[PDB]
């Protein structure tokens, strides 16, 4: 996962498609291009 990198536990998640850390605010904000309800729920929602 993310080549061993540990992302910010609240502000980021390890996105396995790219194996890089990505910002949670982008996948959770439904006004963004990157919004993804499922990925927001699974990877970001409970850490907020």
UniProtKB/Swiss-Prot annotation:
Result for mutant: residue 19 to A: Partially impairs association with egr
Residues of the full protein shown: 34 to 81 of 241
Summary of subunit composition and partner proteins: Interacts (via extracellular cysteine-rich domain) with egr (via secreted TNF-homology soluble form); forms heterohexamers when 3 copies associate with egr trimers. Interacts with Traf6/TRAF2 and veli (via PDZ domain).
Protein task: Acts as a receptor for TNF-cytokine egr. Plays a role in activation of JNK signaling and is required for egr-induced apoptosis, including in wing imaginal discs during development. May also play an egr-independent role in cell proliferation. TNF receptor involved in triggering JNK-dependent proliferation of the enteroblast-enterocyte lineage in response to stress-induced release of egr by intestinal stem cells and enteroblasts. Involved in regulation of insulin production in response to dietary protein shortage keeping systemic growth in check.
UniProt note: phenotype after gene disruption: RNAi-mediated knockdown in gut progenitor cells, enterocytes or cells of the enteroblast-enterocyte lineage decreases stress-induced intestinal stem cell proliferation. RNAi-mediated knockdown in insulin producing cells of the brain mitigates body size reduction in animals fed a low-protein diet.
Record's miscellaneous remark: The name 'grindelwald' comes from the village at the foot of the Eiger mountain in Switzerland after which the TNF gene egr is named.
Top-level taxonomy: Eukaryota, Metazoa, Ecdysozoa, Arthropoda, Hexapoda
Induction: By bacterial infection in the gut.
Glycan attachment residues as annotated in the record: 30
UniProt protein name: Tumor necrosis factor receptor superfamily member grnd
């Amino acid at each position: 996962d993310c080549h061993g990198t540990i992302c910010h536990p609240v502000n980021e998640f390890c996105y396995v498609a790219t194996e890089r850390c990505h910002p949670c605010i982008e996948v959770c904000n439904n006004q963004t291009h990157n919004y993804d309800a499922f990925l927001c729920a699974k990877e970001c929602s409970a850490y907020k």
